[PDB]
Amino acid sequence: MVRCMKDDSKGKTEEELSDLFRMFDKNADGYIDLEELKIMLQATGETITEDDIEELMKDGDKNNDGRIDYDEFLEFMKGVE
Ligand SMILES: [Ca+2]
Ligand SMILES: [Ca+2]
């Protein structure tokens, strides 16, 4: 039958991935760049270099536009290896 609260629909769809994108973003505009990503990366303990970040954007970018967005993230996260 039909429920009220409906706590069965617990499927990890793209709806949940949309949040992961905002985490990486700095100002939450919808796109990510080496400069922006370099900021969030600074929080990490290890000392990453500007060159090391280029690798993250290289494989992270699928539209060869230079930045990463929801469409790119959903594609990058949906099977990185
Ligand atoms: Ca952004
Ligand atoms: Ca792209």
UniProtKB/Swiss-Prot annotation:
GO CC terms for this protein? cardiac Troponin complex
The SS bond pairs are none
Keywords from the UniProt entry: Acetylation, Calcium, Metal-binding, Muscle protein, Repeat
GO terms of molecular function: calcium ion binding; calcium-dependent protein binding; troponin I binding
Keyword Glycoprotein part of the UniProt annotation: no
Q: Which residues bind Ca(2+) 3?
A: D61, N63, D65, R67, E72
UniProt record, GO biological process: cardiac muscle contraction; skeletal muscle contraction
The residues that hold Ca(2+) 2 are D25, N27, D29, Y31, E36
Q: Report domain EF-hand positions.
A: 12-47, 48-81
Give the function comment from the record: Troponin is the central regulatory protein of striated muscle contraction. Tn consists of three components: Tn-I which is the inhibitor of actomyosin ATPase, Tn-T which contains the binding site for tropomyosin and Tn-C. The binding of calcium to Tn-C abolishes the inhibitory action of Tn on actin filaments.
* Family assignment from sequence similarity: Belongs to the troponin C family.
Give the free-text miscellaneous remark of the entry. Answer: Slow skeletal muscle Tn-C can bind 3 calcium ions per molecule. Domain I does not bind calcium.
What this protein is called in its record is: Troponin C, slow skeletal and cardiac muscles
- Tell me the organism: Gallus gallus (Chicken)
Q: Which gene name belongs to this protein?
A: TNNC1
Q: Show which stretch of the intact protein is covered.
A: 81 to 161 of 161
